[PDB]
Amino acid sequence: PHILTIKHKRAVYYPLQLKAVPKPGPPGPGEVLIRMAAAALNHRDHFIRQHLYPNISFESPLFSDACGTVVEVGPGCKRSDELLNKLVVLVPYRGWDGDSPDGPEDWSAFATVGGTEPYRTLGGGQTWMVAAEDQVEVCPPHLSAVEGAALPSCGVTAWRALVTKCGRANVGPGRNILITGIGGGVALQALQMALALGANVYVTSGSEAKLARARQLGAKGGALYTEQDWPKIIAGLLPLAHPLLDAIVDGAGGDIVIRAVPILKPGGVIAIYGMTTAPVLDWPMQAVLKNIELRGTTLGSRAEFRDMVAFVAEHKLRPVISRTVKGLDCVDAIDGLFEDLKGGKQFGKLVIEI
């Protein structure tokens, strides 16, 4: 019965602390007890380690991705027979319900769990977890604990960025979707989802090895953003019957807007979920004239999460996994997965078997 948190140090990097804590008690009313099986590391957790993320905590278990087996259900559980002795996935947030799709109703109530305040009971870096029967969803029956762990926070982000940010009309048969920086956690998730939705999915990478792996997964074409004319290369791959891109799922920022306007249809959506390059963009006047909308997105509503797992459970989508450390005890191995995150040279998710 352990828990994995960061500890104080003094441009910083907090070391990992393995604390032995008592086993959680019986589940309260409407709560379920979860035997943790696997926790996936996410890109957000790297900024927590350098304090570049708001509301970090030296007491909350880390990782926003948790997958475990519900062992005990509490009194008054309406999803009891649905969750008992089954693998479930935690929603990686609270304070965002399905009745407000545009965003959380109260920004002061919304918080991202995992290594942050105030929800110190929710997190993947722990052997046990007690949580509400509404905060978990039934893990797709075809995924292992490692695969289920790699889904929640990067799946609902990609799911929302397609069906709501881009628009279901833009992720269908005959539509052209560019997904920049294939190999990242979020870009891979949408690569599968946009293909299963029926789009003509094209990708962008920095290495020729990552490009080929993307074509192995179903990418109808790709380019290299290291090439000074990558919009024109992607432009050439588009069919004659529809020579333009419908929407873009970018998570790098940079010059994406000024590069993509000439190859994007009027009314094209640039659904941005991250800005790794620079914390600012470049909005040209040609994006205004083309009625182009840069739609920022992050995670998703509670209904969009439930919608997400059901879509993955139906078409049997599986996430690519890069590495996997067998043991929350091995803190040096878990630390190794952090250096591999910073390097940005990866393809798939980095998970930890609990």
| Neighbour count for residue 105 (Cβ, 10 Å) | 12
Paired tokens of 139: 């893990």
The pairing of strands 31-41 and 65-73 is: antiparallel
Residues 143 and 82: their CA atoms lie apart, in Å, by: 17
Per 3-state DSSP, the chain is made up of helix, strand and coil in percentages (nearest 5) of 30, 25, 45
Experimental method reported for this structure: X-ray
Q: Where in the chain is the domain with CATH 3.40.50.720?
A: 156-296
| C-alpha 85 chain-centroid distance | 26
Tokens 């559980």 belong to: 77
| DSSP symbols for 164-200 | IIIITTTSSTT-EEEESSBTBHHHHHHHHHHHHHT-E
Residue 228, burial from CB neighbour count under 10 angstroms (0-12, 13-18, 19+): exposed
| DSSP letter (8 states) at residue 84 | T
For 22, counting Cβ atoms within 10 Å of its Cβ (0-12 exposed, 13-18 middle, 19+ buried), the class is exposed
Resolution (in Å) of the shown entry?
2.9
Domain with CATH 3.90.180.10 in the chain: 2-151+319-353
- For 223, the 3-state DSSP assignment is strand
Query: Can you spell out the DSSP letters for 86-116?
Result: SEEEE-S-BS--TT-TTS-S-TTT-B--SSB
| Token digits of residue 111 | 């918080």
Nearest to 149 by CA among 60, 89, 69: 89
What CATH number was assigned to the domain covering residues 156-296? 3.40.50.720
* CATH topology assigned to domain 2-151+319-353: Quinone Oxidoreductase; Chain A, domain 1 (3.90.180)
